[PDB]
Each structure stands twice: as structure tokens, then as C-alpha cells.
């Protein structure tokens, strides 16, 4: 977890490598990451 609020490339590329569109963070509850 080295990115979310400002470092989106981290959470994004994190999933982008696996295959998913990419991991993005939102205020679903309190700034949490989620892969779509």
C-alpha cells in the first residue's frame, strides 16, 4: 500500500499487471483501494 491519495500509479499498475483494468482508490468508506 504505497499509493492511493496521490500515488494512483501504484495501486493502478498493481492490478494492471495482473490483468484487471487497474486498482483505484475511492471514498467507499475511508480511502480504500479497489481493482475493477
By CB neighbour count within 10 A (0-12 exposed, 13-18 middle, 19+ buried), where does 29 fall? exposed
By CB neighbour count within 10 A (0-12 exposed, 13-18 middle, 19+ buried), where does 3 fall? middle
End-to-end CA distance of the chain: 17
* Solved using: NMR
CA separation for the pair 18, 29 (Å, rounded) = 25
**The total number of structural domains that make up the chain:** 1
Domain hosting residue 36, numbered range: 1-36
Amino acid at each position: 500500500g504505497f499509493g492511493c491519495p496521490w500515488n494512483a500509479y501504484e495501486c493502478d499498475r498493481h492490478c494492471v499487471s495482473k490483468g484487471y483494468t487497474g486498482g483505484n482508490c475511492r471514498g467507499k468508506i475511508r480511502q480504500t483501494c479497489h481493482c475493477y
